[PDB]
């Protein structure tokens, strides 16, 4: 039942590097005999976690060679050497050694590329969608990187919203981008009741929001 | 090698019981000791619960969060493991994966394929496919991006698929999210201003639970 603290949650590498997952604890890990359980596990994007290492520092049956636990106590550490393709995948740490069994976050291990700006789209509500009285205002926040970004709503000058969602893409398997679907509901009432409606995205390669638009009675 | 195989789960409503069963037709089940691990979709990997050895007098261990509702078993005469969940909530709703322990490695060492769990007071709804083109936030590009949106439908089991005529990918499925009880799920396709408007984009949506196929035409 001990709190563990992975870090960093997002980390960058590049084919052949040396990354590095830290890991802590809120205890020490240290049984009596048998000793400091922590372990490692790699999941990959739709499979289920592979065991890594076990207590510290044992390879499993098959880990190539270029992962590796060292630590005690409170902070351990998995060394992964030259990272390769395979390698890519969420990263957590488990402590055995209480009663409940816990995990960290994870550390999703994502490929490194040169920062890249959003390509902005911005959709009114469609036709179809009012004749059934629902007004869905999105925009798609396209090919970007890296996948942090903040976008807003504003209707009318500026307000915020409630019925929004949020879906981002995994990595993009060619091109090493991100993208964003940014969806704001309204009845559609509410929608015939305002003009101006604007996301505003902020990413690292800009200080000022990407801002689109569209005002109703323009369609 | 020696996978535990997992079974059971579905659809089944809030309130309701579910008995998940651990086949791991391997060796020593008897001396062992099982768990189970579950994921909500998204999320890291929460322990359920282990069940120790006949040699223990197969003591129980449970996360907080399912005892008094979730019960673990296991029939060494026949190598299965049982997970008796009853009195379900949404929040119940996992990917959930019996775990081979092993005294000598440590804690979590095969896990199985896994059993998914979807929790949920709904039934059948189609998709509300709506075309999201350029209307009037402009007109502004040598590209242009448009969209689907596939509103509210269950269970999940979608298909965008986009006639273009080939004249580049540029495709994006944003993953589908809960609004409400229902899905939400988008897409994008980044065709030539050269050949659209004055052509087609359709957009075709496939749903096997409901037998609907709402394919929206985009000008």
């Known amino acids: 039942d001990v709190v563990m603290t992975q870090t960093p949650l997002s980390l960058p590498v590049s084919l052949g590097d040396q990354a590095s997952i830290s890991c802590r604890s809120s205890?020490?890990?240290?049984?009596?005999?048998?000793?400091?359980?922590l372990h490692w596990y790699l999941q990959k994007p739709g499979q289920s976690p592979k065991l890594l290492i076990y207590?510290?520092?044992n390879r499993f049956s098959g880990v190539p060679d270029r992962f590796s636990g060292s630590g005690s106590g409170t902070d351990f550490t998995l060394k992964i050497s030259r990272v390769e393709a395979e390698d890519l995948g969420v990263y957590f740490c488990?402590?055995?050694?209480?009663?409940?069994?816990?995990f960290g976050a994870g550390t999703k291990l994502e490929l490194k590329r040169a920062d890249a700006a959003p390509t902005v789209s911005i959709f009114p509500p469609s036709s179809e969608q009012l004749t059934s009285g629902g007004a869905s205002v999105v925009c798609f926040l396209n090919n970007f990187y890296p996948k942090d970004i903040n976008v807003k709503w504003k209707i009318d000058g500026s307000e915020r919203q409630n019925g929004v969602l949020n879906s981002w893409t995994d990595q993009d398997s060619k091109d090493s981008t991100y993208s964003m679907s940014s969806t704001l509901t309204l009845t559609k009432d509410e929608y015939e009741r305002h003009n101006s409606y604007t996301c505003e995205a902020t990413h690292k390669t800009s200080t000022s929001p990407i801002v689109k638009s569209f005002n109703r009675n323009e369609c | 090698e020696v996978q535990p195989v997992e079974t059971g789960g579905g659809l089944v409503q809030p309130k309701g019981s579910l008995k998940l069963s651990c086949a791991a037709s391997?060796?020593?089940?008897?001396?062992?000791?099982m768990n189970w691990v579950r994921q909500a979709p998204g999320k890291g990997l929460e322990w359920v619960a282990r069940?120790?050895?006949?040699?223990?007098?197969?003591?129980?261990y449970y996360a907080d969060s399912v005892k008094d509702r979730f019960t673990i078993s296991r029939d060494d005469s026949q190598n299965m493991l049982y997970l008796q969940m009853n009195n379900l909530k949404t929040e119940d709703t996992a990917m959930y994966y019996c775990?081979?322990?092993?005294?000598?490695?440590?804690?979590?060492?095969?896990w199985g394929q896994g059993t998914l769990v979807t929790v949920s007071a709904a039934k059948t709804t189609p998709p509300s496919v709506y075309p999201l083109a350029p209307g009037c936030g402009d007109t502004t590009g040598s590209s242009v991006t448009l969209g689907c949106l596939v509103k509210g439908y269950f269970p999940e089991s979608v298909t965008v698929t986009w006639n273009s005529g080939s004249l580049s990918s540029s495709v994006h499925t944003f993953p589908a999210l809960l609004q409400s009880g229902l899905y939400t799920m988008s897409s994008s396709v980044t065709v030539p201003s050269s050949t659209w408007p004055s052509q087609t984009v359709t957009c075709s949506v496939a749903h096997p639970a409901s037998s609907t196929t709402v394919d929206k035409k985009l000008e």
């Open positions: 775990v081979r322990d092993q005294t000598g490695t440590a804690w979590f060492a095969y």
């Open positions: 391997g060796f020593s089940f008897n001396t062992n000791a």
């Open positions: 069940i120790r050895s006949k040699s223990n007098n197969y003591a129980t």
């Open positions: 205890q020490s890990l240290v049984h009596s005999n048998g000793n400091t359980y």
């Open positions: 207590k510290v520092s």
């Open positions: 488990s402590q055995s050694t209480h009663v409940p069994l816990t």
